[PDB]
């Protein structure tokens, strides 16, 4: 059901690695450093560091000829672990909160994407989140730009729970 | 020496998965619905590679996720391992502020169901686990989210994988 | 090219485990608890926890007869994963910053080690780092003491990016 092809070099050149399952460490046997990717069946969630840590990259089906094709930010060219991302959800519901522990101003998003949180009274601060239904991806900047943070069904009482160092988010969309 | 049986559904129904060693990713079973710990304790985790919310699993029966989890942060359980608790003594130092600063409390071979009984409020910002394995909780009487402290030093609440320094009770992991 | 020998007991006694590749868990049918280490060919980057998490220990070539020989901080006696560390760099360039997102006072270090950041206008605070060339290791206390944090070539916009809970650093050196 899932398949990703990772290449040692840019433009789908060099050593080729096909994966149909999660990989907690790409340097364990597979590649030295991922240069390009083809997602044949996904989506996949890729990570800058080993064991599904560090910066996140949602990889939909398609071609990524270089690291700047999957990184919407330019913080890191490292990709060391990745896994299939379960997106089997008919409805999407997300609650964003101004302050930690689901306190302060609240924004509810239902079966829609938000390219700018500013259009709904928020600033560039999201300090707790409730992903009621579906999988979502939040971004640092408007129009789905900068670093990505994935929200799967569950509660996030503080920005550290979604692996962010700061509560800055300016756009969010459903993974579908 | 260790053995856990995980079931796909609640009340020990559906597909089974027997483990006698750590598992960094349960992906084998779609979603754990119930657990029988035959020989433990085990330390279970909401996420892969021993990350996310923690659940200490002593020997016994857990017919549904709310039997092992006290919070609503997740029903997901994706990794788990045997927890070594072979320690004759237990010593824990709790600190008010990060980097072992401010008010200090020492706990020796005892459990504390309310930190408020010892002048601590609900703020623990650094910890020293001198001897033994401990488990701290958000609320008094060992309620809410759990955080395991194995022997070592924690200069900030993020070191024990907490987003905030709130703790109100703590106990030793022992039989 | 890489080789580490791990022993069950102190002073290179008990059961042995030889590794020439990364190991995400030393308790997964290898050893009960590492008591001593010989690095035959390195350097290696070791970790307190499984899956390359927790406190870091840079292990150069040589003999470590007890846990407190590799841990320059009486933090933990635990060592559960480790990997070879690539240090193939002819030059070393590091930029340290006072505040996150490469803001505030800046220190540039070129092909040199700094046993005290205080000797160059910093306090015990480093909140973002640019590792332009080479691999580096930062420490909590002056003279390379306390907990270690490895910096590989790349950008670190916040202290959490190098897996620190706080921006306290007082010395830094090249891994060579």
Coordinates of N, CA and C in Angstrom, one line a residue, chain B residues 15-172:
Chain B
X15 N -6.7 -10.1 17.3 CA -5.4 -10.5 17.1 C -4.5 -10.2 18.3
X16 N -3.5 -11.2 18.6 CA -2.6 -11.1 19.7 C -1.2 -10.8 19.2
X17 N -0.4 -10.2 20.0 CA 1.0 -10.0 19.8 C 1.8 -10.2 21.1
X18 N 2.5 -11.3 21.2 CA 3.3 -11.6 22.4 C 4.7 -11.0 22.3
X19 N 5.2 -10.3 23.3 CA 6.6 -9.8 23.3 C 7.3 -10.1 24.6
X20 N 8.6 -10.5 24.4 CA 9.5 -10.8 25.6 C 10.7 -9.9 25.6
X21 N 10.7 -8.9 24.6 CA 11.8 -8.0 24.5 C 11.2 -6.7 24.0
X22 N 12.0 -5.6 24.0 CA 11.6 -4.2 23.6 C 11.1 -4.2 22.2
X23 N 10.2 -3.3 21.9 CA 9.7 -3.2 20.5 C 9.7 -1.7 20.2
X24 N 10.6 -1.2 19.3 CA 10.6 0.3 19.0 C 9.5 0.8 18.1
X25 N 8.8 -0.2 17.5 CA 7.6 0.2 16.6 C 6.7 -1.0 16.5
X26 N 5.5 -0.9 17.0 CA 4.5 -1.9 16.9 C 3.9 -2.2 15.5
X27 N 4.2 -1.3 14.5 CA 3.7 -1.5 13.1 C 4.0 -2.9 12.5
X28 N 1.6 -6.2 12.1 CA 1.8 -6.8 13.4 C 0.6 -6.6 14.4
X29 N 0.0 -5.4 14.4 CA -1.2 -5.0 15.2 C -1.6 -3.6 14.7
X30 N -2.8 -3.3 14.4 CA -3.3 -2.0 13.8 C -3.3 -1.0 14.9
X31 N -3.9 -1.3 16.1 CA -4.1 -0.4 17.3 C -4.3 -1.3 18.5
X32 N -3.5 -1.1 19.5 CA -3.6 -1.9 20.8 C -4.9 -1.5 21.5
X33 N -5.7 -2.5 21.8 CA -7.0 -2.3 22.5 C -7.0 -2.7 23.9
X34 N -6.1 -3.7 24.3 CA -6.0 -4.2 25.6 C -4.6 -4.9 25.8
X35 N -4.2 -5.1 27.0 CA -2.9 -5.6 27.4 C -3.0 -6.5 28.6
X36 N -2.2 -7.6 28.6 CA -2.0 -8.5 29.8 C -0.4 -8.5 30.0
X37 N 0.0 -7.9 31.1 CA 1.4 -7.9 31.5 C 1.6 -9.2 32.3
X38 N 2.3 -10.2 31.7 CA 2.6 -11.5 32.4 C 3.8 -11.3 33.4
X39 N 4.8 -10.7 32.9 CA 6.0 -10.4 33.7 C 6.6 -9.1 33.3
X40 N 6.7 -8.2 34.3 CA 7.1 -6.8 34.0 C 8.0 -6.2 35.1
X41 N 7.9 -4.9 35.3 CA 7.0 -4.0 34.6 C 7.5 -3.6 33.2
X42 N 6.6 -3.1 32.4 CA 7.0 -2.6 31.0 C 6.7 -1.1 31.1
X43 N 7.5 -0.4 30.2 CA 7.2 1.1 30.0 C 6.7 1.2 28.6
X44 N 5.5 1.6 28.4 CA 4.9 1.8 27.1 C 4.9 3.3 26.7
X45 N 4.8 3.5 25.4 CA 4.9 4.9 24.8 C 3.8 5.1 23.7
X46 N 3.3 6.3 23.7 CA 2.3 6.8 22.7 C 2.9 6.7 21.3
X47 N 4.2 7.0 21.2 CA 4.8 7.1 19.8 C 5.9 6.1 19.6
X48 N 6.4 6.0 18.3 CA 7.5 5.1 18.0 C 8.8 5.5 18.6
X49 N 9.8 4.5 18.8 CA 11.1 4.8 19.3 C 11.1 5.4 20.7
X50 N 10.2 4.9 21.5 CA 10.1 5.2 23.0 C 10.0 6.8 23.2
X51 N 9.1 7.4 22.5 CA 8.8 8.9 22.5 C 7.3 9.1 22.9
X52 N 7.0 10.3 23.2 CA 5.7 10.7 23.5 C 5.2 10.3 24.9
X53 N 3.9 10.3 25.2 CA 3.3 10.1 26.5 C 3.7 8.6 27.0
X54 N 4.1 8.6 28.3 CA 4.5 7.3 28.9 C 3.5 6.7 29.8
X55 N 3.5 5.3 29.8 CA 2.6 4.5 30.6 C 3.4 3.4 31.2
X56 N 3.5 3.5 32.6 CA 4.1 2.4 33.3 C 3.1 1.3 33.4
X57 N 3.5 0.1 33.0 CA 2.6 -1.1 33.0 C 3.2 -2.2 34.0
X58 N 2.6 -2.2 35.2 CA 2.9 -3.3 36.1 C 2.2 -4.6 35.7
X59 N 2.5 -5.7 36.3 CA 1.9 -7.0 36.0 C 0.4 -6.9 36.2
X60 N -0.3 -7.5 35.4 CA -1.8 -7.5 35.5 C -2.5 -7.2 34.2
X61 N -3.9 -7.0 34.3 CA -4.8 -6.9 33.2 C -5.3 -5.5 32.9
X62 N -5.3 -5.1 31.7 CA -5.7 -3.7 31.2 C -6.7 -4.0 30.1
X63 N -8.0 -4.0 30.4 CA -9.0 -4.4 29.3 C -9.3 -3.3 28.3
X64 N -8.8 -2.1 28.5 CA -9.0 -1.0 27.6 C -8.0 0.1 27.8
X65 N -7.8 1.0 26.9 CA -6.7 2.0 27.0 C -6.9 2.9 28.2
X66 N -8.1 3.2 28.7 CA -8.3 4.0 29.9 C -7.9 3.3 31.2
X67 N -7.6 2.0 31.1 CA -7.0 1.2 32.2 C -5.5 1.5 32.4
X68 N -4.8 1.8 31.3 CA -3.3 2.1 31.4 C -3.1 3.7 31.3
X69 N -4.0 4.4 30.7 CA -3.8 5.9 30.6 C -4.8 6.7 31.5
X70 N -4.2 7.7 32.2 CA -5.0 8.6 33.0 C -5.3 9.9 32.3
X71 N -4.8 10.2 31.1 CA -5.0 11.4 30.4 C -5.9 11.2 29.1
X72 N -6.1 12.2 28.4 CA -6.8 12.2 27.1 C -5.9 12.7 26.0
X73 N -4.6 12.7 26.2 CA -3.6 13.2 25.3 C -3.5 12.2 24.1
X74 N -3.7 10.9 24.3 CA -3.7 9.8 23.3 C -4.2 8.4 23.7
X75 N -4.8 7.7 22.8 CA -5.2 6.2 23.0 C -4.2 5.4 22.2
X76 N -3.2 6.0 21.5 CA -2.2 5.4 20.7 C -1.1 4.9 21.6
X77 N -0.6 3.7 21.3 CA 0.5 3.0 22.0 C 1.4 2.3 20.9
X78 N 2.6 2.9 20.6 CA 3.4 2.5 19.5 C 4.7 1.9 19.8
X79 N 5.2 1.9 21.0 CA 6.5 1.3 21.4 C 6.4 0.9 22.9
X80 N 7.3 0.0 23.3 CA 7.3 -0.4 24.7 C 8.5 -1.3 25.0
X81 N 8.9 -1.3 26.2 CA 10.1 -2.1 26.6 C 10.0 -2.5 28.0
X82 N 10.8 -3.6 28.3 CA 10.9 -4.0 29.8 C 11.5 -2.9 30.6
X83 N 11.0 -2.7 31.8 CA 11.6 -1.7 32.7 C 12.4 -2.3 33.8
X84 N 13.7 -2.1 33.8 CA 14.5 -2.7 34.9 C 14.3 -1.9 36.2
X85 N 13.9 -2.5 37.2 CA 13.6 -1.9 38.5 C 14.3 -2.6 39.7
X86 N 15.4 -3.3 39.3 CA 16.3 -4.0 40.3 C 17.1 -2.9 41.0
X87 N 16.5 -2.3 42.1 CA 17.2 -1.3 42.9 C 16.8 -1.5 44.3
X88 N 17.8 -1.8 45.3 CA 17.4 -2.0 46.7 C 16.9 -0.7 47.4
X89 N 17.5 0.5 46.9 CA 17.2 1.7 47.5 C 16.7 2.8 46.5
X90 N 15.9 3.8 47.0 CA 15.4 4.8 46.1 C 15.7 6.2 46.8
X91 N 16.3 7.1 46.0 CA 16.6 8.4 46.4 C 16.3 9.4 45.3
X92 N 15.5 10.4 45.6 CA 15.0 11.4 44.6 C 15.1 12.8 45.2
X93 N 15.7 13.7 44.4 CA 15.7 15.1 44.8 C 14.9 15.9 43.8
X94 N 13.9 16.7 44.3 CA 13.1 17.5 43.5 C 13.5 19.0 43.7
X95 N 13.5 19.8 42.6 CA 13.9 21.2 42.7 C 12.8 22.1 42.1
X96 N 12.6 23.2 42.7 CA 11.7 24.3 42.3 C 12.0 24.9 41.0
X97 N 13.3 25.1 40.7 CA 13.7 25.8 39.5 C 14.7 24.9 38.6
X98 N 14.8 25.2 37.3 CA 15.8 24.4 36.5 C 17.2 24.5 37.1
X99 N 18.1 23.6 36.6 CA 19.5 23.5 36.9 C 19.7 23.4 38.5
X100 N 18.8 22.6 39.1 CA 18.8 22.2 40.5 C 18.9 23.4 41.5
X101 N 18.1 24.4 41.2 CA 18.1 25.6 41.9 C 16.7 25.8 42.6
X102 N 16.7 26.7 43.6 CA 15.5 27.0 44.4 C 15.3 26.0 45.5
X103 N 14.0 25.9 46.0 CA 13.6 25.0 47.0 C 13.9 23.5 46.6
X104 N 14.4 22.7 47.5 CA 14.8 21.3 47.3 C 14.1 20.4 48.3
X105 N 13.7 19.3 47.8 CA 13.0 18.2 48.6 C 13.7 16.9 48.3
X106 N 14.1 16.2 49.4 CA 14.7 14.9 49.2 C 13.7 13.8 49.6
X107 N 13.5 12.7 48.8 CA 12.7 11.6 49.1 C 13.5 10.3 49.1
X108 N 13.5 9.6 50.3 CA 14.3 8.4 50.5 C 13.4 7.3 50.9
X109 N 13.4 6.2 50.0 CA 12.6 5.0 50.2 C 11.2 5.2 50.7
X110 N 10.5 6.1 50.0 CA 9.1 6.5 50.3 C 8.5 7.0 49.0
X111 N 7.1 7.0 49.1 CA 6.3 7.6 48.0 C 5.6 8.8 48.5
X112 N 5.3 9.8 47.6 CA 4.7 11.1 48.0 C 3.4 11.3 47.2
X113 N 2.2 11.0 47.8 CA 1.0 11.1 47.0 C 0.5 12.6 46.8
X114 N 1.2 13.5 47.6 CA 0.9 15.0 47.4 C 2.2 15.8 47.8
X115 N 2.8 16.4 46.8 CA 4.0 17.3 47.0 C 3.7 18.5 47.9
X116 N 2.4 18.9 47.9 CA 1.9 20.0 48.7 C 2.1 19.7 50.2
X117 N 2.2 18.4 50.6 CA 2.5 18.1 52.0 C 3.9 18.4 52.4
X118 N 4.8 18.7 51.5 CA 6.2 19.0 51.7 C 6.6 20.4 51.2
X119 N 5.7 21.4 51.2 CA 6.0 22.8 50.8 C 6.3 23.0 49.3
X120 N 6.1 22.0 48.5 CA 6.2 22.2 47.1 C 4.8 22.5 46.6
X121 N 4.7 23.2 45.5 CA 3.3 23.5 45.1 C 3.0 22.4 44.0
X122 N 2.9 22.9 42.8 CA 2.7 21.9 41.7 C 3.9 22.3 40.7
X123 N 5.1 22.7 41.2 CA 6.2 23.0 40.3 C 7.4 22.3 40.6
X124 N 7.9 21.5 39.6 CA 9.1 20.8 39.7 C 9.8 21.0 38.4
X125 N 10.9 21.8 38.5 CA 11.6 22.2 37.2 C 12.9 21.5 37.0
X126 N 13.4 20.8 38.0 CA 14.6 19.9 37.8 C 14.6 18.8 38.8
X127 N 15.2 17.7 38.5 CA 15.1 16.5 39.3 C 16.4 15.7 39.3
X128 N 16.8 15.1 40.4 CA 17.9 14.2 40.5 C 17.4 12.9 40.9
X129 N 17.5 11.9 40.1 CA 17.1 10.5 40.5 C 18.4 9.8 40.9
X130 N 18.8 9.9 42.2 CA 20.1 9.4 42.7 C 20.1 7.9 42.7
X131 N 19.0 7.2 43.2 CA 18.9 5.8 43.2 C 17.5 5.4 42.8
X132 N 17.3 4.3 42.1 CA 16.0 3.7 41.7 C 15.3 4.5 40.6
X133 N 14.2 3.8 40.2 CA 13.3 4.3 39.1 C 12.1 4.9 39.8
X134 N 11.6 6.1 39.3 CA 10.5 6.7 39.9 C 9.5 7.1 38.8
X135 N 8.3 7.4 39.1 CA 7.3 7.9 38.2 C 6.6 9.1 38.9
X136 N 6.6 10.2 38.2 CA 5.9 11.4 38.7 C 4.6 11.6 37.9
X137 N 3.6 12.3 38.5 CA 2.3 12.5 38.0 C 1.9 14.0 38.1
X138 N 1.0 14.4 37.1 CA 0.5 15.8 37.1 C -0.3 16.1 38.3
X139 N -1.1 15.2 38.8 CA -2.1 15.4 39.8 C -1.8 14.6 41.1
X140 N -2.4 15.1 42.3 CA -2.2 14.3 43.5 C -2.8 12.9 43.5
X141 N -2.2 12.0 44.3 CA -2.8 10.7 44.4 C -2.5 9.8 43.1
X142 N -1.4 10.2 42.4 CA -0.9 9.5 41.2 C -1.9 9.5 40.1
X143 N -2.4 10.7 39.7 CA -3.4 10.8 38.7 C -2.8 11.7 37.6
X144 N -3.4 11.6 36.4 CA -3.0 12.4 35.2 C -1.8 11.7 34.5
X145 N -1.2 12.5 33.7 CA 0.0 12.0 32.9 C 1.2 11.7 33.8
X146 N 1.9 10.6 33.4 CA 3.0 10.0 34.0 C 4.3 10.3 33.3
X147 N 5.4 10.5 34.1 CA 6.7 10.8 33.6 C 7.7 9.9 34.4
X148 N 8.4 9.1 33.7 CA 9.4 8.1 34.4 C 10.7 8.8 34.6
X149 N 11.3 8.6 35.7 CA 12.6 9.1 36.1 C 13.5 7.9 36.4
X150 N 14.4 7.6 35.5 CA 15.4 6.6 35.8 C 16.6 7.3 36.3
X151 N 17.5 6.5 37.0 CA 18.7 7.1 37.6 C 19.4 8.0 36.6
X152 N 19.6 9.3 37.1 CA 20.2 10.3 36.3 C 19.8 11.7 36.7
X153 N 20.3 12.7 36.0 CA 19.9 14.1 36.4 C 19.1 14.8 35.2
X154 N 18.1 15.6 35.7 CA 17.2 16.3 34.7 C 17.2 17.7 35.1
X155 N 18.0 18.5 34.3 CA 18.2 19.9 34.6 C 17.0 20.8 34.2
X156 N 16.0 20.3 33.5 CA 14.9 21.0 33.0 C 13.7 20.1 32.8
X157 N 12.5 20.5 32.9 CA 11.3 19.7 32.7 C 11.3 19.0 31.4
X158 N 11.9 19.5 30.3 CA 11.9 18.9 29.0 C 12.7 17.6 29.0
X159 N 13.7 17.5 29.9 CA 14.6 16.3 30.1 C 13.8 15.1 30.5
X160 N 12.6 15.2 31.1 CA 11.8 14.1 31.4 C 10.6 14.0 30.5
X161 N 10.7 14.7 29.4 CA 9.7 14.7 28.3 C 8.4 15.4 28.6
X162 N 8.4 16.3 29.6 CA 7.3 17.2 29.9 C 7.3 18.5 29.2
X163 N 6.2 19.0 28.8 CA 6.1 20.3 28.2 C 6.1 21.5 29.2
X164 N 5.6 21.1 30.5 CA 5.5 22.1 31.6 C 6.0 21.5 32.9
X165 N 6.5 22.3 33.8 CA 7.0 21.8 35.1 C 5.9 21.4 36.2
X166 N 4.7 21.0 35.7 CA 3.7 20.6 36.7 C 3.8 19.1 37.1
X167 N 4.0 18.9 38.4 CA 4.0 17.6 39.1 C 3.4 17.7 40.4
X168 N 2.5 16.8 40.9 CA 1.9 16.9 42.2 C 2.0 15.7 43.1
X169 N 2.6 14.6 42.5 CA 2.8 13.3 43.2 C 3.9 12.6 42.5
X170 N 4.6 11.7 43.3 CA 5.7 10.9 42.7 C 5.8 9.6 43.6
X171 N 6.1 8.5 43.0 CA 6.3 7.2 43.7 C 7.4 6.4 43.0
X172 N 8.0 5.5 43.8 CA 9.0 4.5 43.3 C 8.3 3.5 42.5

